[PDB]
Amino acid sequence: KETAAAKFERQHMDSSTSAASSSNYCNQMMKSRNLTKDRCKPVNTFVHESLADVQAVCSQKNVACKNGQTNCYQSYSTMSITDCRETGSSKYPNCAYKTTQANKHIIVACEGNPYVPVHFDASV
Known part of the structure; x- marks a missing residue:
């Protein structure tokens, strides 16, 4: 059993x-x-920063999540991120992706004790 905090990492x-x-x-x-593994996840974001710096976003700017929830938080600083999206040719199990580099503010949903990221919501 993978906890939500472990799955985010x-x-x-x-x-x-x-x-x-x-x-x-x-x-x-x-x-x-x-x-x-069982499907080609269509979109996924990787963050290139220390875990402590990412966990601290849970104490930063509170904003609404894309689904109307209110436990989301936006980073004060921009972070180095890599955006992965499926190409037109991608077809499971032969998944294929386009790599795009970016430096944006990230928005994550936090939960638990301690209060940590459990979902990557978006970037701005």
Whole structure:
């Protein structure tokens, strides 16, 4: 049983690079994080910052989530992120992605004790 806090780190954290090293970054990471296991996840964001810096966003700017919920929080600083989206050719199990580098503010939904990120909502 994977906790929601643990699943967020598997799906979104990559503190090991300052940014996506190549255009094949997503194809490789989507596969290695088990995100293409039973279906090709259509969109996924990776964050290249320390976990402590990402966990601290839960104490920053409170904003509404895309689904109307109110437990979302936006980062005061921009963060290095990599946006992964399926290409027109992608077809399970042969999932394929486009890698795009960006530096944006991130919005995550927090929950629990301690209060941590459990869902990546969007970037602005």
